[PDB]
Amino acid sequence: MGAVALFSARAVDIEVFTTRPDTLFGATYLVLAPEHDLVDELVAASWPAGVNPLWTYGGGTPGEAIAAYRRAIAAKSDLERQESREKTGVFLGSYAINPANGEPVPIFIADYVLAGYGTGAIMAVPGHDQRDWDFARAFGLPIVEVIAGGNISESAYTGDGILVNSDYLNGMSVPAAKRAIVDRLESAGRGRARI
Numbered sequence: 001m002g003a004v005a006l007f008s009a010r011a012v013d014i015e016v017f018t019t020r021p022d023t024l025f026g027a028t029y030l031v032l033a034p035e036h037d038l039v040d041e042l043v044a045a046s047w048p049a050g051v052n053p054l055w056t057y058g059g060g061t062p063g064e065a066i067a068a069y070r071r072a073i074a075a076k077s078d079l080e081r082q083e084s085r086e087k088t089g090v091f092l093g094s095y096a097i098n099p100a101n102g103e104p105v106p107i108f109i110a111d112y113v114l115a116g117y118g119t120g121a122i123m124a125v126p127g128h129d130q131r132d133w134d135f136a137r138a139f140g141l142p143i144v145e146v147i148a149g150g151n152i153s154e155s156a157y158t159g160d161g162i163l164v165n166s167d168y169l170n171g172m173s174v175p176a177a178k179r180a181i182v183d184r185l186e187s188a189g190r191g192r193a194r195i
């Protein structure tokens with residue numbers, strides 16, 4: 001006869017659900033549902049210096065921007081919610097740590113992530129999930145190849161392949177890498193395989 005994994009706040013743990021744990025070294029940002037419990041806690045008092053203006057929703061502070069995003073998306077109808085071409089969202093002003101590579105990744109809210117499904121939070125892997133590719137292109141976020149086989153400059157590569165840019169997974173198949181990364185997550189106490 002997937003996985004859940006924790007990402008620690010850099011400054012609180014954010015649990016994500018993924019069907020692609022093998023791609024963990026390519027997760028370049030996190031996305032929470034706009035109504036996720038942790039959003040208010042994770043929101044920074046001010047924007048980082050040098051923040052991309054595309055990330056701020058035009059708000060003077062992260063809290064103002066999140067409040068406006070929540071208010072605006074309430075003006076959407078079923079028509080907009082079943083369209084999916086355009087990806088919108090807001091940076092919280094804070095970072096999480098990717099458990100695989102120890103790197104800081106920015107945290108966003110976006111209405112493409114649904115509050116009542118999974119854990120209400122995802123890891124975003126633009127190289128390998130077209131939804132995340134689209135968001136990353138719209139926001140100027142990094143797009144990293146970890147599964148060789150496609151051409152990430154053109155579109156997300158969603159098929160089987162060989163791990164690259166993924167340290168102790170490198171050279172594995174996708175099925176083998178899924179098992180290896182879950183074993184690492186379990187050894188560290190930071191995740192589990194789930195149906």
Ligand SMILES: NC[C@H]1O[B@@-]2(O[C@@H]3[C@H](O2)[C@@H](COP(=O)(O)O)O[C@H]3n2cnc3c(N)ncnc32)c2c(OCCO)ccc(Cl)c21
Pocket residue numbers: 017018019020023112113114115116117118119120121122123124125128129132
């Ligand atoms: N996004 C990075 C990574 O991770 B996945 O994105 C998460 C998760 O795994 C997947 C779970 O969907 P499924 O259960 O199979 O229908 O949809 C996203 N999801 C998880 N919870 C949410 C959520 N509340 N709102 C929106 N979307 C979500 C994922 C892919 O999913 C294909 C479907 O399996 C495909 C490629 C890759 Cl690399 C991934």
